[PDB]
């Protein structure tokens, strides 16, 4: 809650052009860039991500200018395709949550 107070009254008043996403102490947490991105994305301010493993921000509908260098968990399928192909496996049982 206090993050929103400090973003507007202390950051954008200093002529900020790029913001780097922090890292939560516990990896299970998710709302690390949630309050900053909404305020930063209000004025079309580009934001660069450093510790962002969530694919929620990449839908291009919400968090339009949310850029990151670290792929989220959703890109692991691009290697599952090739690994089973070189291992001569074609029938796969897919279990997801």
């Amino acid at each position: 809650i206090q993050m929103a107070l400090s973003v507007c009254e202390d950051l954008i008043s200093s002529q900020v052009y790029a913001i780097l996403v922090s890292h939560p102490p516990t990896p299970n947490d998710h709302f690390t860039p949630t309050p900053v991105s909404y305020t930063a994305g209000f004025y079309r301010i580009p934001v660069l991500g450093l510790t962002t493993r969530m694919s929620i921000y990449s839908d291009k509908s919400i968090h339009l200018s949310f850029l990151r260098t670290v792929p989220p968990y959703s890109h692991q399928s691009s290697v599952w395709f090739e690994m089973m192909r070189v291992y001569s496996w074609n029938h796969i049982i897919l279990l997801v949550s």
Partner: protein
């Protein structure tokens, strides 16, 4: 249990160097451009983009 992992995926400090490396030539390309504007003045002063 077979799995995969990524290299330098948890060390935040390592990727900060790449964070500023990419923007090195990005700002310069934008620097040599016309009609350069400024960020909004505060949270209550400006409501435009």
């Amino acid at each position: 249990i077979l799995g995969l992992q990524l290299i330098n995926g948890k060390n935040e400090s390592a990727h900060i160097s790449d964070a500023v490396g990419v923007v090195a030539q990005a700002v310069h390309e934008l620097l040599e451009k016309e009609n350069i504007t400024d960020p909004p003045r505060g949270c209550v002063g400006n409501t435009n983009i």
